[PDB]
Amino acid sequence: DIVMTQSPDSLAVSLGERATINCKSSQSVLYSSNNKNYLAWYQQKPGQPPKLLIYWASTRESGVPDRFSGSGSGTDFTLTISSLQAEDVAVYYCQQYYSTPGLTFGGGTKVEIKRTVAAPSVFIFPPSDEQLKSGTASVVCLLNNFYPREAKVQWKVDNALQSGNSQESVTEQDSKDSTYSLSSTLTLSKADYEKHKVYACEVTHQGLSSPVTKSFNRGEC
Amino acid sequence: QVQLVQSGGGLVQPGGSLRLSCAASGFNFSSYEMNWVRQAPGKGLEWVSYISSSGSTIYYADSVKGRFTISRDNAKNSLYLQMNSLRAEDTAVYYCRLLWFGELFFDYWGQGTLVTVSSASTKGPSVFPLAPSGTAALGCLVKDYFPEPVTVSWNSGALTSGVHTFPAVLQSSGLYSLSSVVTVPSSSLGTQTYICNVNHKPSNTKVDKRVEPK
Amino acid sequence: GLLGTITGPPQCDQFLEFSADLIIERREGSDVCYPGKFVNEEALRQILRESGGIDKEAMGFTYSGIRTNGATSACRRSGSSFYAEMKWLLSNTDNAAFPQMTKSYKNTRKSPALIVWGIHHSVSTAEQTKLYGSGNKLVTVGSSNYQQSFVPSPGARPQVNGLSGRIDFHWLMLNPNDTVTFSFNGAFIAPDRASFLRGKSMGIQSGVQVDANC
Amino acid sequence: TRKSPALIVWGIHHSVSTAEQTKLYGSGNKLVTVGSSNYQQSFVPSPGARPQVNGLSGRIDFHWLMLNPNDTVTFSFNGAFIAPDRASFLRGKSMGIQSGVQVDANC
Ligand SMILES: *[C@@H]1O[C@H](CO)[C@@H](O[C@@H]2O[C@H](CO)[C@@H](O[C@@H]3O[C@H](CO)[C@@H](O)[C@H](O)[C@@H]3O)[C@H](O)[C@H]2NC(C)=O)[C@H](O)[C@H]1NC(C)=O
Ligand SMILES: *[C@@H]1O[C@H](CO)[C@@H](O)[C@H](O)[C@H]1NC(C)=O
Ligand SMILES: *[C@@H]1O[C@H](CO)[C@@H](O)[C@H](O)[C@H]1NC(C)=O
Known part of the structure; x- marks a missing residue:
């Protein structure tokens, strides 16, 4: 079956930036005797189902404003x-509807708008x-309200680096300010x-x- | 207006079985091709099976070869999906349908269903305060519940500004854990009460845990 | 009909390979269940009137990215099927891309072979998309002394057997130690098996009964 | 609607050029395909230069079929069509010949 790809996986391009998403295919999707490309674009937000964007490769779907446009032909768009x-x-996903009873979609791509670089606010509990x-x-x-998304945390207990007993997660970029926040947990038994x-x-x-460290001494405040 | 709705989702245990179901509105049913598409938790989309107009042809995928059974009804307006010998890669949320045809247009997907092939038993959270020590941070830890999802609010929804609620993580225990926070003026700690309100509908549990400085 | 043993509607299933020194034709003989008409049909009778029977030898076409099971409501065997020795090559689903295919067959016998295909002139330009891809179709055949080209004719028609679309069945004759070639992408009614004339007999017409002891 | 069969005549207008095919009809290719329970055809107008006959270089090729009693005919087209207004109905028995001479009635 026709296997699909996109690049970049994620692009954080700023507001008003001509965002360019490149998308590929293993097998061709341009039928011969009518000369048409079987390619669609969709828009899903987490929890939402896909919304139709572009079809026939180069034909916008109604309800989509003018900034959207589909280009390319053959194997790349x-x-x-x-x-x-x-x-x-x-x-955003690409999708083939060339072969039939196997519609292969893609790997996707998120487009989070940049903004100005912002150092994290750091709190320990x-x-x-x-x-x-x-x-x-x-x-x-x-780590509250920072940009860009790329950030690194290290845990030390009495100046010794921890490995294997912590986990973390990251917010979607915040709408109110285009920032991210990040939460990390070190889990120990009571005894440790x-x-x-x-x-x-x-x-x-x-x-x-410079890297910033925050700390407390257990049983002190 | 054309519209769709899926149903038959929940918690099942692998090697087991479920029977999904679609319902329709606003078009000649019996005349079109009907697909099925699932999306694993934060993964890519996948085509399951379809039926032609007369139901005279059906085509599945290889992950469900001999495990799933799509089925139709044209008098009633229903399209079914029986599932059997469920495995853990079959954990997903399901949608679908198109417009076939040549020419003109279409579109069209449903709103969805949570289906997880996690045999494990259902479990509610414990709630612990994350105590504060110009701007201060405070929060609540929601640890050890299963399955997804949960809801968190602050002050019965009265505190919105500065709030961040994080994605759950799966611990080595097989339970999910997540945290929720709000930033507020340091000067507000003492006059103002902050309470986090937690709802975990899979276990019908409801805890308010007040978070105070120590 | 005499030509019904070559396509084999749901009525000539025992005369697919009928061994005989004599042929009788009736006022209700019909070469067709899905409406249509052969091209140079009477010529084939006179040859077949004197053929002594036909030896169905399998031709061997393997269909890849489509269906073979093509079926309609007129040519019913049990429910809805097609001619016996003819795969109605629908698209892959019910509109899909009917890719560009090409098959060939060779004669390994000292006798010549009977090759029958057909064009599916669809009732509309959409019903040409309902079963095959969109865009124009050309089924051109090839031989060392036969070179043709057909274009399916999409156009409205009278409803014969509830169907308005037609199927015009052609034929040629492949000499021993030679081949035939089809290049196409649509509206094709494929052949599964090609006849082989058995020897000498005679076909007539009458509208009366038979006698065997005289 | 008659116990006798009818005579149906139409024609294709092969235009003299590809423009004179636009001069009288729309642009783009034309297909006039007919239909019957035992007649199924398809014509394509043939735009091409020709000799001038009667000052005209474009041609009109007239076809015909025969519609049995209690049946119909169907035309689907979008161009180069010379339409029929009235269809003949054969009256009975007679004879046609050829000669290049005069007639006589009293013999
Ligand atoms: C769209 O909805 C209409 C509702 O009006 C459906 O109409 C009816 O469909 C049935 C099934 O095909 C027809 O029954 C049969 O008609 C055929 C002739 O095509 C005949 O050979 C059979 O013995 C049987 O009586 C019925 O005629 C038709 N109604 C009308 C007024 O024609 C239809 O199924 C839906 N789908 C499509 C694709 O139209
Ligand atoms: C058929 O053709 C082959 C090769 O083209 C040749 O060797 C053979 O003599 C021919 N005749 C028969 C009867 O096989
Ligand atoms: C003509 O057809 C109609 C209906 O198809 C039928 O009732 C009639 O008997 C037929 N014959 C004549 C002479 O009208």
């Missing part, structure tokens, strides 16, 4: 949002006593937590001329 907008923060009474200790580090004093989070980011 490109969507050019001539003026990238904030309504256009979505996941100890486990609650209710939690400690339950026998485990979770430690939390918060009560064994150490100084707990620290170290953060690296382009907006920081």
